[model samples]
Target chain A: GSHHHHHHHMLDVVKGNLIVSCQALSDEPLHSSFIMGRMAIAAKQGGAAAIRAQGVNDINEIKEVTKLPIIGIIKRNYDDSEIYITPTMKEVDELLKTDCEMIALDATKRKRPNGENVKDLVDAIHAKGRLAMADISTLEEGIEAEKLGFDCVSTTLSGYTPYSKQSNSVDFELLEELVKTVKIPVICEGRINTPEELKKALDLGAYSAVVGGAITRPQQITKRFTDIL
Target chain B: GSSHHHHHHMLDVVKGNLIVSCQALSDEPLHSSFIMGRMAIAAKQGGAAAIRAQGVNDINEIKEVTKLPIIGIIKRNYDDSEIYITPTMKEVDELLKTDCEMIALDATKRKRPNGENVKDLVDAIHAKGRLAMADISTLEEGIEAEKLGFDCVSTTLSGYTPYSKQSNSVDFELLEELVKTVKIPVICEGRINTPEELKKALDLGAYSAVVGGAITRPQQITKRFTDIL
Candidate 1:
């Protein structure tokens, strides 16, 4: 199911424009795989050059319905200590089964699932000739992911957990730091909700950018209307 | 193209549980009608039980794919003010052509498309034998929407715009105030991004609740992952 051929083409877009992506996986009782798929389609129609999706079913459905490039990641909780894109071989296997163009793994300095290091996971993604997106929440993590030979670096995990509290909005502050520090392409992917944020990210020389909710998240959309009344 | 006949069924669900719905419209250049439809279907399959959608194309496509009750709104930006959602009778007329079960409108103190009052819009929704969901952002707006005979009052716009900045999160502060002040069901919306937030809204006596990004939003999802790495 892996569409490796698409990855080569996606590199062109990822290397230039902002790649608006979606992430619809949560531990909440209301989120489901089907909803994830629909959100992906919404992202595509909204002019997303690519999609960042989770789960095998969601990636498969997005690939089937839309031609947008997908950067796939698998989020599984392994005990309470680790979450957010656990880079296990199983996740890579699942990504391989889908038509996702790239695979994002937890590139943080913390221990991976079963003590696997960042190098091990990056090697796996590269072995399959698929691009690797380093999901980093902190500048230290971003530097680490880039140093480990990640093809792309994304600020996807900033400000989401206790360990990465320093990571704020994905604008010039973080994107500039990454661009100045890293040789590989820096893809900004944090709490970019408004059009201004996207413009700002691109202006900071971010290789590409990805936005999700302000585009495909209905709960947020309704809240924006309902909350102002 | 509106589905006035299905309004009663929607009311039944709203009266029963805190209906989980999705909203797919925003000023962000990331979403459109087709994507919103897919999001509605995902919300349905994810056990949302109900969906809050936007635009005619989205509502019709959602009806074609899912059996979930829908709360539809038409978001058309008017002059100067932020008023939208059936901003005029023309939008209401257009919405009447779809299969949505309910219609939500801006029930704030703001004037309508041509300087019309909120009461006139409420009467239109009622005259069509359809349910009217009042999207109110403040406690005062909630009470007013209820007084105007809206079937349900939604706290959807709480912290978004300037007028309704009184409440920052969708919890007891806003929902409790609305519940105590109004006789109608107060549906809590806005900024409820976690399972705990949803539960808290219900515990505070909200009739129904809608959560989007915490469920369907992928940008926030990717941000959570990337920011924390």
Candidate 2:
């Protein structure tokens, strides 16, 4: 049976609030799980409604530090597939061991490793008493993710996919279409910079907004100034 | 006679306020002079006290769009030196034609083109009815700039110089030391990412603080989050 209590719990926790992504890849400066845990604490102090994190290690550490609900993903490249965010069931199994309430996966229509379908991964997440969030590139993909039983869908990969509409700012049109077309929660993520932009997204009916580098990444912030010279 | 009115005017205008640097180098995406002009208008609306701009084109455009005073520089490389920011009299001559109230130059002890001294550029800036702001790396350079007749000294090249102490954040120690050592207004300019940092710099006795990419550069802001995936 699916965890209806857990589902409603997260919705109440994150609704109409901000989710701060506290992830750092290996090559990034703040890559340690301890640092991410501290980052989560900082985000919490700033009134973040929830945390979106990557990998088992960070999820474990963040859970140790804060009571905030986590939307988790593990980014790993598979030889056979371009879809890296929780591409197969193995990655989902690892996340299930952690206390993350939601597991987000690449819900694009791209080929999956071992010819696996996103539907199978959604079933696996539900079986483990966790909710599934789709990281989608387009409106059709967001609609398909709801059909496959994802609890929510985010405009995370809007500009990342080859065929998706590319933009320097948040895909408001896609966010609008997703909110209009899907019954599931539509999260506005990726490339959201200013407070005005974040407010605009929520005003347009985003369930919640996710911001990462605009608050946390100092190097990127510094380069924006240095590049001008 | 040196431009005494211009000297006091800029100091009074920028004192204890934010000077937003609106610049984009040739290799960057928003390199057009017209866009930099628009950027200046936005910064002014957001309560920027003045603008720090580069080259003749951007300075001219920024002057057209806003009534805010500008700290100007023309960055050009000379094979004889690493000092690129207003490295030669040629760049100073170019900037003097614009309405920019002040001229900023690299004031480190590094060799300049054709053995041109920093003293000469300071005198040149002063003679053209403009104020000279020294972009210095250390307290020694700030003292030297004051002796050479700069109206102000900025911690613009602190972490940029090879011989200077490199830190991920603003060189607060250097700023503190410079304020203590130099009688001239010490402007904190580099690697400032947050509001707290800017406030702290001013509280530590910086005449004002200049912020660039943290507010203006969208491409750099986008890369910070995207690089994590």
Candidate 3:
């Protein structure tokens, strides 16, 4: 079951099911590489087809522990925009040093660090023979990212961006429409908090699903029960 | 600075804007008492008028750290149904041991852990001189909980239960309908992940809003950045 392959080619492992990614960030108080490694194990136990991980520490740790395909990202805060995670060439250079199977970066339409264009980054990812997944927020952004030659499009930052704030959750309505609008595989990831929501995303023809808090983040795990009371 | 105290009664604390609770279960790996206590502080910092906390440890920690009015609950897993949190007289008796300004329980029509009716729990919460908040998932449940004399009706469980899974996040439609049908203040909770969703809940005439992950959870936070690539 040892599937050692280049990061760009890993999506083949995620072909038919919604890929669940158990993400752990560095800034969160409870975040730890060991905990995230264990979370990756749990996602595997829960039948997640793939894992989305962050930071070299977690990526390396998860790689050591799980056979699941890992979609890796490096989140570094910058002064220009809230955009991070391979936000610029610097972070991409850092991610290449890791043995991660795939790399995800800030693929939104916003200005990249140091005024770089998204095409430059996509070209760079492709040059390394690594697949580039566009973490987009809106239907228009997804379309633009696909046109720029992204390997995959994810509805990850749907409501976080300033422009997309007008919409509350990922427009699954848009994802359903985008399936017909675009030729590239659409991976749905934003605000999908339940099993039903995940099913809905896949039924709408999403290539894969990446779920986090419902599986990994304990703060979110407990908040559901607490706030409901 | 503290504003006017409308009444010496507890209703004064619940009046005006809805309070967002930052609680989650303790047993889950995602949260601990210290984490939730910090969330209570963050909720206060975010301008939440009151804080709703869960579990004895979390409530105690929040109280020791802040003076924010707290609606407290204890979530226990029962053998029969998934419902818990003041689910029985036993849990209600335990909650009276705390200083929470109000007690919120599973006021849905679902049978209680020991087969008691929902009204028994509501009456038990009110008998202690603490306000009873009905955490209903549907408009019918809201109406039924209101008829049982709950001090407040919350759409908190809306879109969360097994039966209401078809409804979108927070059931704003049921919230609007409940607001029109009932005379009591309606509190909206569940799946509210954005400031826009929060505003929409308020605009629909919900007396108070209770958001958790949008305000507290970290799993969703990490996923937001991880899927960026």
Candidate 4:
């Protein structure tokens, strides 16, 4: 019962708030972990409830700078499969070394590298006393994640998959379907471009929302202006 | 003296605060007056003391959306001179048609198109009961703007002019010198990429600071990330 109480407590903290994603790919200009730390600090100052970060270094730096709970993932490309986000036990092991409260992994229908079962990843996260968040592209994947014991499901990969809906805006349709079907929290994420969109997602019963690129990725924000040019 | 009182009243509104530049070049993606109006709304929501906008359409649209004062400009390149920002009486007349409270013009040492003196433009703004903000590149230009009876001088052109400092970051050296030399309000602008830089500029005794692409131009923000990549 105490375990259940603790589980609900962490989830409740961000139940109706914004989780800012602070990430910079190695190829990007704001690539350093130090900058990511500052980015997280600024996000916190701007009223973010939590942070979703990539890489051990950035997560650690973010932890040092802000008290917000982190949803951690590792993005590593594997030639064997297209699934790169916390794709294997190796990345999961890496996250376990950090103090992240939740570990998010690609929970799409695609086969992961080394032919590992997605169920094992969920169990691994639970075993470590950390929450597992499924990053799914479709409603079926969200259901599968719930059945496999994920603590929450986020529409993070909604537009990234080949089989999912191909759109530039937030996957509100998928978010609605997933929220209606999934018993666990359905966090709306991906391509949420404005404050109004963020509010609409929450109004549609999203347990929480995550806004990336729009706030932290100045380069992506700049592209939004330049692309019009 | 009542004219002087009204002039001081307008300047006091943005004293020691952040002025958001909500502008989009005609060639840019988010160039429409409608979008710039929303941009100003968002800036106001995020605590902008005022807006610096370009074009009659944008300034008018912004005025309809928010009551915050606007520093108006018009960018039209002439064949003979590099001075495009409100270069002559035509652009000033265009801005005066709108309800913009102030006019910003290129106050660099460079020759104006058709041999028009910048002093004439300053006089034109004051004649219309609108304040004139000098966008200057060097300390000498800031001092010269004060002598020409300009209301304020901004370090908006510090790195833009051919002979000025060719640097990427905010021109703190020029900002410091201008603040020390000019009796008129010195606005810190141009390449203020971070909140810390904005604060540093204010700490250095700038009457106010204006941030443009960093907050308003998403494409420029995206470039900051991709450039490192």
Candidate 5:
């Protein structure tokens, strides 16, 4: 409502609150941007403090419906790099067009396409008076992200990278290490799959936890039931 | 499109296809009726054949947007009983007000809430020109539901009741037992958590499968990922 309230106020709205990731990739069921807006309405109704959304179309729809600050990302494959989640300035430039309060980028050790560094991406977002959030896979990565001046850090990439441990569960150990080691505010994300784990993640000192898939993706939830004999 | 498709045609449409359950409890994040409708539309875009929804309000909203056949249930907690999902005639009548094609009943061995019988409920749904789907916990219950003239039986309550088996995965053993024992069609459901599991459910000779949580409930899916670590 108040555009002049400043960025920290926007961050404060998300701190200690649950941020639902209302994402539906193009190939996913329920991939409509308008549906993402409806999803945001439901998440806000369910007491979410903020939203972590993907793509400009979804951000456009979500902004039309809710005033909750957004942690935005554009998931694009560059055909060369595995760091597809908010990989470079290309995604950031698109996200800046939306009214998102913060932009999240991959902060892992993987190589960036176009050689556009994380610093430039963060500086561009900073120049726009918005925030830059780092989606990291490891404690070392989180440390480096903070060193590079990311406004905050999230455990959004654990188990996605080939080098990271592959598991279905949230990387609690990594989150624990990040919260203990990183000076920047840590946002628990990705596989924080349950209310217990959500509570635990917040308890472990996450500034906030971004919950996706479990809340938004029905195809994945149904598979969990059908997988066993 | 004319809303005059035969019930058998609806059944045919769902055979060998995915039916996403567009549901959110009152306490859940995506609990709004309109959001459920939006979820149904997106699921339809993603190639969902049918929608399994809860309550008259949500059914009405989802029906307004998606033309796919709806399997409707009303989840209301009675102070005296644990049988909440479409427990009685009141809920069934409530569903009749909506354009739901099928009615799902909690056909477990537990006591019904209002001294009403499962057979009578199925009869009422039949009288209303809609198909009756029995949500059973055991193969024995499935057999009983078939004997009682339920149009189909779903293993939707396997782990939800005390006498039922508690599993994080699909109850394929019970499904196999029911498929062989019953002459009527059997629908596999509950904890069918993967595409492989969905494929396996169809391979096991289920008439169809109704998948919830995994496809529709983001909170649950997120919990699934976070629980492993």
Candidate 6:
């Protein structure tokens, strides 16, 4: 029943429009659900097709303010493991309670907090009848995510996992590699900083793209100019 | 009659909404008029009161895309002086031809290019039947901007000078000082990175605030996470 909606509603909402990740951590100055809501409003005003939000609080706030479809995750770090972004079924269940149309979870080669596999966590999200997106660091990991029945794959975990290589610029090489190998839609994400980068990703046959910092982070924007001069 | 329209029309549009500075220099990745115009569309979707942009080409592109009013400037480096943001009548004249409701000029005490004064730039913008906003480093500059007939003054340059003390965070002390001393509306801008910071700026009696990197810069947003984690 829910599969019909996920198959159509999700893609129609995201097609070519920008999806802004509006988040501020506990220490990061912009951290607040109310603020993320306002930012979602700002992104919607700017013609964003959808919103990618972190934590239950932000998803709730953004949902209240704008009707834009949400890609939801919960970033909670436990002292036991490094996988903080939607690390377990617990976080998935929390997101399942919200109105988010899609769920994004880390699907890297790294170990989970409870020693559970990525498939188990993905299965948990599916039990709630919502679409799942795997955030991967490498092309190999993206292939693994596709095999696991993730509705979509995003290059979000690139350069994020401890073992992944960091590309000084936007990781176009990774996007090219993933799009060719992955059967499911490869949505380019992570460090996409310009309109050129966004256009390049779509041209390469990516199903969609998500842009965060270049469009949303003020501290990094100032630092770019400050670093040059 | 249109002269009075320019006087009231410019500030009124910007007074209530969050004005965002959307720009990318030639060296940076997102540096294009097309991208900036789309950014204004996103900003309008986000509820920004006006668009604070750089250069004439970008102002024209942004004006074409959104009805939201605009605050414009041109950032050019001169060999003789440190004043870079809208430092001369040459830049102001370029902005005057565009639909930018207000033109932002450096009103700091620093010597402008060609021995030009802030007065000359403000007079030139006002002569074109548009409003003027002074980007200042100190309360003294804000007061002087008012005397020189700028319609408003912003704490945009509160800490960027090589000769003055640099701020480690948002400059609230300077904002408070400007609010108390300047009879003209004080627009709080620069170093405002969070929703709390945005709320504080408005609560501090600012006419409105301009948020740049936090709302629009992507590379900076990614760097913020990579830096801390």
lDDT of each: 0.70, 0.83, 0.72, 0.85, 0.82, 0.78
True contacts kept of each: 0.04, 0.00, 0.00, 0.00, 0.18, 0.05
Which 10 consecutive residues of model 5 chain A have the lowest summed lDDT?
A: A220-229
Candidate 5 residue A101 C-alpha distance from true site, Å: 1.3
TM-score list, all predictions: 0.55, 0.56, 0.54, 0.56, 0.65, 0.55
Model 4's CAPRI class is incorrect
Clashes of each: 33, 1, 11, 26, 28, 21
Stretches of model 5 off by over 4 angstroms after superposition = A1-3, A6-8, B1-20, B23-229
In the range B166-198, model 6's lDDT, one tens digit per residue, is 985688888888888888889988877666677
**Fnat of candidate 4:** 0.00
Q: lDDT tens digits, residues B1-229, model 1?
A: 4643434466566553535544555643225555555566555544466877778877777777676778888888888557876788888878888867688888888767677777887787778777899888788888878788898998887876576665545545878888888988788888775555776777788877877665555555444433422
Q: What tens digits encode model 2's per-residue C-alpha lDDT throughout A175-211?
A: 8999899988999999886676787888899998789
Cα deviation of A90 in candidate 5 (Å)?
3.1
Please write out the lDDT profile of model 6 over residues A1-229, one tens digit for every residue: 4333234487666776567788767765456676567567667756677889998889988998888899999998977778888988888889998999899999888888888788988888788777899998888898989888999999898888767767757777888888788778888888875566777888777778887766565544434432321
How displaced is residue B49 in candidate 4, in Å?
0.8
> How well does candidate 4 match the true structure in TM-score terms?
0.56
Error of 1 at B202 (Å): 26
Name the 10 consecutive residues with the lowest summed lDDT in model 2 chain B.
B220-229
Interface RMSD of each: 9.9, 13.7, 9.0, 14.8, 6.1, 13.7
Name the docking class for model 2.
incorrect
Which number leads on lDDT?
4
Model 3 lDDT, residue A136, Cα: 79
Residue-level lDDT of model 1, residues A61-89, one tens digit each, is 77877677889988887763475584688
